[PDB]
Design an enzyme around this catalytic site. Structure first.
Site, PDB file in Angstrom:
ATOM      1  N   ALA C  21      13.317   5.425 -12.598  1.00  0.00           N
ATOM      2  CA  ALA C  21      14.255   6.534 -12.702  1.00  0.00           C
ATOM      3  C   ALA C  21      13.901   7.769 -11.879  1.00  0.00           C
ATOM      4  O   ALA C  21      14.068   8.909 -12.389  1.00  0.00           O
ATOM      5  CB  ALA C  21      14.381   6.983 -14.192  1.00  0.00           C
ATOM      6  N   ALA C 117       4.472  -3.011  -9.119  1.00  0.00           N
ATOM      7  CA  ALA C 117       5.528  -3.139 -10.080  1.00  0.00           C
ATOM      8  C   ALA C 117       6.566  -4.033  -9.453  1.00  0.00           C
ATOM      9  O   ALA C 117       7.187  -4.840 -10.137  1.00  0.00           O
ATOM     10  CB  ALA C 117       6.114  -1.817 -10.388  1.00  0.00           C
ATOM     11  N   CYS C 169     -19.644   1.622   5.296  1.00  0.00           N
ATOM     12  CA  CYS C 169     -20.551   2.323   6.245  1.00  0.00           C
ATOM     13  C   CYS C 169     -19.865   3.408   7.039  1.00  0.00           C
ATOM     14  O   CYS C 169     -20.447   4.431   7.370  1.00  0.00           O
ATOM     15  CB  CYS C 169     -21.279   1.328   7.121  1.00  0.00           C
ATOM     16  SG  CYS C 169     -22.545   0.480   6.035  1.00  0.00           S
ATOM     17  N   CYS C 407       5.347 -19.899   0.174  1.00  0.00           N
ATOM     18  CA  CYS C 407       5.226 -18.727  -0.637  1.00  0.00           C
ATOM     19  C   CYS C 407       4.246 -19.043  -1.777  1.00  0.00           C
ATOM     20  O   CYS C 407       4.317 -20.113  -2.407  1.00  0.00           O
ATOM     21  CB  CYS C 407       6.589 -18.280  -1.163  1.00  0.00           C
ATOM     22  SG  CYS C 407       6.532 -16.794  -2.220  1.00  0.00           S
TER      23      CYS C 407
HETATM   24  N1  JZU Z   1      10.610   6.915  -5.470  1.00  0.00           N
HETATM   25  S1  JZU Z   1      10.555   7.729  -6.733  1.00  0.00           S
HETATM   26  O1  JZU Z   1       9.243   8.369  -6.699  1.00  0.00           O
HETATM   27  O2  JZU Z   1      11.643   8.730  -6.773  1.00  0.00           O
HETATM   28  N2  JZU Z   1      10.790   6.839  -7.963  1.00  0.00           N
HETATM   29  C1  JZU Z   1       9.736   5.968  -8.376  1.00  0.00           C
HETATM   30  C2  JZU Z   1       9.944   5.873  -9.872  1.00  0.00           C
HETATM   31  O3  JZU Z   1       9.586   4.542 -10.336  1.00  0.00           O
HETATM   32  C3  JZU Z   1       8.735   4.676 -11.486  1.00  0.00           C
HETATM   33  N3  JZU Z   1       7.738   3.574 -11.683  1.00  0.00           N
HETATM   34  C4  JZU Z   1       6.699   3.268 -10.882  1.00  0.00           C
HETATM   35  N4  JZU Z   1       5.984   2.228 -11.343  1.00  0.00           N
HETATM   36  C5  JZU Z   1       6.589   1.909 -12.501  1.00  0.00           C
HETATM   37  C6  JZU Z   1       6.306   0.869 -13.523  1.00  0.00           C
HETATM   38  N5  JZU Z   1       5.235   0.088 -13.333  1.00  0.00           N
HETATM   39  N6  JZU Z   1       7.122   0.761 -14.607  1.00  0.00           N
HETATM   40  C7  JZU Z   1       8.151   1.612 -14.731  1.00  0.00           C
HETATM   41  N7  JZU Z   1       8.435   2.585 -13.825  1.00  0.00           N
HETATM   42  C8  JZU Z   1       7.671   2.746 -12.715  1.00  0.00           C
HETATM   43  C9  JZU Z   1       8.001   5.967 -11.233  1.00  0.00           C
HETATM   44  O4  JZU Z   1       7.393   6.546 -12.399  1.00  0.00           O
HETATM   45  C10 JZU Z   1       8.977   6.868 -10.488  1.00  0.00           C
HETATM   46  O5  JZU Z   1       9.680   7.800 -11.297  1.00  0.00           O
HETATM   47 ZN    ZN Z   2       8.723 -16.376  -2.465  1.00  0.00          ZN
END
Ligand code: JZU
Ligand code: ZN
Lengths: 313, 79, 548
Positions: C21, C117, C169, C407
């Site tokens: 989000a 993620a 190093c 893959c």
């Molecule tokens: N590009 S951004 O920085 O505007 N948004 C990245 C957005 O995605 C969320 N995020 C990152 N990693 C995870 C996981 N592992 N689970 C749920 N959400 C996650 C970030 O917190 C960021 O807000």
């Molecule tokens: Zn694949």
């Protein structure tokens, strides 16, 4: 050096893209945006997050029950309320550093000197006539001019930046560069009855012509195709196509006979895309950083095409 | 083999020119590119006429002319 | 609403998942609802932060410190309280987001900012058999694509970039770029205030082979005996260590030797944004000192013996690294950098703006629709360019590619080969650096493929703790041994083939597969003399010349 620590922390991630100078330009820049339906709302949101000095949002129309039951600048059930006025609230929250004003007077009624408090003007939902009167005014006054619209799955922007100076980054810092735009009038009226022309028409998206059609249906009916009047509107469209193809010399299939399906109303994701691009064109224009696209952008939301056409010289 | 000048264009509208032998494994070109540009190899994707180019494809095989164009697309992973 | 019978019911019908989000995130949520997506799940593991406020339009300054997911839902609701949104504040790697969970959705959309993620979500959707749309932005660029089990390649069909890695190093002995000094300052912060980590020592390395033809006191220990005294740490790092390096003189035969710094000398001898100013040595020195004072305090505010976690946004952690890196820089004759630049390099900040995310999130919903009405065959990878391409294209829609048979994720019985020293490598290193970190598994179980099924690693907390310290050879693992790695959560199973090697170069613990310096160096000059003997006779396979 002279933005606040508050601004520095919020603009951090853009300053790292385009530098403090460009952002100082934005910050000194005042923008007129006309019409606040879907496309207008995206641009408003984009320019306010960018932190222009101020945005004036002009719309004389009110919220209809035909208007989308969801609009992100406009709390529910606000039918009867002025568009620009309903909007102002959610819009100004986006960024307290921006002076967000409204204006409710129809754009046609506006005197020449009214435009001179704006470094850029951008038109949404305007009739072709408006588009020309305003472009011409902005030419007379060295104002940056833009227009754009969404039609179902299609969208376009247009830009007239006159004699436009900008700096670019040099790929191994900074290079001075110049690029020359021409009136909307000359861009919407190409002599295809040429040799240059008929040659280049090969490389020219049908969407340029879809434009003409749609602009006409707008001039003769004062609204864009609505959906709960589909049948009525479809024929009108099929018709208009031909009369306009006739008047410059184009074979009635170079624009598909099938377009009518996917150009009704406004698709929210098309507003987002086209408003993303246009907004960014405007930012580019005010900060005089990076090349601005030579006059038209056409987006086809079915194909996922975005074309940039130079149409006028 | 014989030779062609090919041009590689970036999203960042960059434009690197190359002279390449029609028989070359195009991976050699990718490697050439990433070196003259400082980027680690599979940080990229090379396109000829909207279509992918794999390591062992050849300018002959893909039917490449003089002056032709290759487009590099880098995958962003922010958001 | 403005979409055809089948599709609009399918959209009020279906449930969708938006993972993340931020920039793409808020933008997506808005589009999905305005397009009329009635049922929407939303997950972010994060709170709101001020640097977000230029592109995550659902959030205002009043919202700093609250959950990105929740506030996002609140904000949509004000404009459209009809809409259905379930909002989780949590990492999607959390064990509660199992296959069953993913199975509800008709579509999953990534809105993430990291590869880990995405590697996980990729796997959940292969396992739940659900199309996913993947996407990404940076600065003026980004892309969108569709992934469909059985139809298209998966997120990991093709190797992506790895995070940039520096030889030990180079960090501890012979830095030559500002990035080496900044990586040194992060490691130091980690030795002093974070979780001590042997791969992250900042002390000079006496075993550098560039320098060859009783222990000395470690950094954390020297800290402890002086009680984290700023000035003694200064002297230790920027003076006594440098004196020692000078001892390792085969290092400075061609490079300019580091010059050691003295605390008292540096204190005796004493637009753009504030953070864009480069200060003098004295100032960095003083900031280093003040930074230790503050972090010693932050450290005493920890409950229950816990450590600091490095954060670009914590002033004094950022100052610590700024001041330490600048001093390392100076000592090695590099021009010092500003906090602003250092923050960027240390934090790996990606420039990001609103319009770029707006464009991408727009494309996401459009491709969504195509998928949801069987037009998957019209789906593309759409690239967003800064400038239009030769055929006039700013958005360049490009052909999906099919699943790559080799893959190591999406193939039938996926399988890799790993080259390592079965005597140097431990179970722990297998667990964390290989299985969790390289192969992105979240909580692996690992066994030998030997029908007894000897266990190595369990995902069940305190089951294979005793095994951590043991080298792999203690189980008989050697060349050709085969291990089986399972991530039950991702419902993923990977067989690892071991290639034993002794010749890797003491920082390099593994890699994935798939006299005579006066003879064998004066032979390169005539293996290049012969290579373009046949070039200039119209007769050589591979030949590329750079021009411009
Ligand atoms: N590009 S951004 O920085 O505007 N948004 C990245 C957005 O995605 C969320 N995020 C990152 N990693 C995870 C996981 N592992 N689970 C749920 N959400 C996650 C970030 O917190 C960021 O807000
Ligand atoms: Zn694949």
């Amino acid at each position: 050096g002279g933005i606040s620590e508050e601004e520095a922390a919020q603009y951090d991630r853009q300053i790292r893209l385009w530098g403090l100078e460009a952002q100082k330009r934005l910050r000194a820049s005042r923008v007129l945006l006309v019409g606040l339906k879907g496309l207008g709302a995206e641009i408003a949101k984009n320019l306010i997050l960018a932190g222009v000095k101020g945005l004036t949002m002009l719309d004389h129309e009110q919220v209809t029950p035909e208007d989308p039951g969801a609009q992100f600048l406009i709390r529910t059930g606000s039918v009867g309320r002025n568009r620009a006025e309903a909007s102002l609230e959610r819009a100004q929250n986006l960024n307290p550093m921006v002076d967000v004003k409204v204006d409710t007077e129809d754009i046609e009624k506006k005197p020449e000197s009214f435009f001179t408090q704006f470094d850029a003007v951008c038109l949404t939902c305007c009739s072709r006539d408006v588009i020309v009167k305003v472009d011409q005014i902005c030419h007379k006054n060295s104002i940056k001019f833009f227009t754009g619209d969404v039609f179902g799955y299609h969208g376009y922007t247009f830009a007239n930046l006159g004699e436009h100076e900008f700096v670019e980054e040099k790929t191994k810092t900074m290079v001075k560069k110049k690029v020359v735009f021409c009136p909307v009038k000359e861009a919407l009226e190409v002599d295809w009855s040429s040799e240059k022309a008929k040659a280049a028409l090969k490389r020219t998206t049908s969407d340029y012509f879809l434009l003409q059609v749609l602009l006409k249906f707008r001039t003769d009916k004062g609204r864009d195709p609505s959906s709960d009047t589909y049948e009525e509107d479809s024929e009108l469209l099929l018709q208009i196509r031909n009369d306009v193809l006739d008047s410059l010399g184009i074979s009635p299939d170079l624009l598909p006979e099938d377009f009518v399906r996917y150009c009704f109303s406004e698709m929210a994701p098309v507003c987002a895309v086209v408003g993303g691009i246009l907004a960014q064109e405007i930012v580019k224009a005010l900060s005089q950083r990076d090349p601005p696209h030579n006059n038209f952008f056409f987006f086809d939301g079915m194909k996922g095409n975005g074309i940039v056409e130079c149409l006028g010289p | 083999g014989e030779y062609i000048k090919l041009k590689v264009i970036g999203q960042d509208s960059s434009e690197i020119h190359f002279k390449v032998k029609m028989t070359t494994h195009l991976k050699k070109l990718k490697e050439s590119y990433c070196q003259r540009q400082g980027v680690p190899m599979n940080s990229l994707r090379f396109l000829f006429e909207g279509q992918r180019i794999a390591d062992n494809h050849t300018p002959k095989e893909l039917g490449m002319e003089e002056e032709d164009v290759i487009e590099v697309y880098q995958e962003q992973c922010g958001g | 609403r403005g979409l055809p019978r089948e599709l609009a019911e399918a959209v009020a019908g279906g449930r969708v998942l938006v993972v993340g989000a931020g920039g793409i995130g808020c933008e997506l949520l808005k589009n999905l609802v305005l397009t009329g997506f009635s049922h929407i799940d939303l997950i972010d593991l994060d709170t709101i932060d001020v640097s977000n406020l230029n592109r995550q339009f659902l959030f205002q300054k009043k919202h700093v410190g609250r959950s990105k997911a929740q506030v996002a839902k609140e904000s949509v609701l004000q404009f459209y309280p009809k809409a259905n949104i379930v909002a989780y504040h949590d990492s999607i790697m959390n064990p509660d987001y199992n296959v069953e969970f993913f199975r509800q959705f008709i579509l999953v959309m990534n809105a993430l900012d990291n590869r880990a993620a995405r590697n996980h979500v990729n796997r959940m959707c292969l396992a739940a058999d659900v199309p996913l749309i993947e996407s990404g932005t940076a600065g003026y660029l980004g892309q969108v694509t569709t992934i469909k089990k059985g139809v298209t390649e998966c997120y990991e069909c093709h190797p992506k970039p790895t995070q940039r890695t520096f030889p030990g190093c180079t960090i501890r002995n012979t830095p030559s770029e500002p990035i080496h000094c900044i990586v040194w300052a992060k490691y130091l912060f980690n030795q002093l205030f974070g979780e001590e980590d042997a791969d992250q020592e900042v002390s000079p390395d006496r075993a550098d082979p560039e320098a060859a033809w009783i222990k000395r006191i470690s950094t954390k220990e020297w800290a402890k005996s002086t009680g984290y005294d700023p000035v003694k740490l200064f002297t230790k790092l920027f003076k006594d260590d440098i004196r020692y390096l000078l001892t390792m003189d085969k290092l400075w035969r061609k490079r300019k030797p580091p010059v050691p710094l003295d605390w008292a000398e540096v204190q005796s001898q004493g637009l753009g944004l504030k953070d864009q100013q480069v200060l003098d040595v004295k100032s960095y020195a003083r900031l280093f000192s003040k930074s230790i004072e503050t972090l010693r305090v932050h450290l005493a505010e920890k409950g229950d013996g816990a450590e600091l976690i490095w954060d670009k946004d914590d002033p004094s952690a950022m100052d610590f690294v700024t001041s330490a890196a600048n001093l390392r820089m100076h000592i090695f004759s590099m021009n010092m950098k500003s906090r602003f630049d250092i923050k960027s390099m240390a934090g790996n900040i990606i420039p990001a703006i609103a319009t770029t995310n707006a464009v991408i999130a727009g494309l996401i919903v459009l491709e969504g629709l195509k998928i949801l009405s069987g037009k998957i065959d019209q789906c593309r990878t759409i690239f967003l360019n800064k400038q239009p391409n030769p055929r006039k294209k700013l958005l360049v829609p490009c052909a999906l590619d099919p699943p790559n048979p080799n893959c190591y994720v999406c193939a039938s019985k996926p399988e890799v080969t790993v080259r390592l020293n079965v005597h140097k490598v431990t179970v722990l290193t297998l667990q964390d650096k290989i299985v969790k970190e390289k192969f992105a598994m979240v909580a692996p179980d690992v066994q030998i493929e030997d029908g007894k099924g000897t266990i190595l690693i369990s995902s069940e907390e305190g089951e294979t703790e005793a095994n951590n310290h043991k080298k792999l050879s203690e189980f008989g693992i050697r060349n050709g041994s085969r291990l089986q790695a399972d991530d039950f959560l991702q419902d993923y199973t990977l067989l690892i083939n071991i290639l034993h090697s002794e010749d890797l170069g003491k920082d390099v613990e593994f890699e994935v597969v798939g006299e005579r310096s006066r003879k064998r160096k004066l032979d390169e000059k005539e293996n290049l003399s012969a290579k373009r003997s046949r070039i200039e006779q119209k007769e050589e396979l591979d030949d590329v010349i750079a021009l411009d």
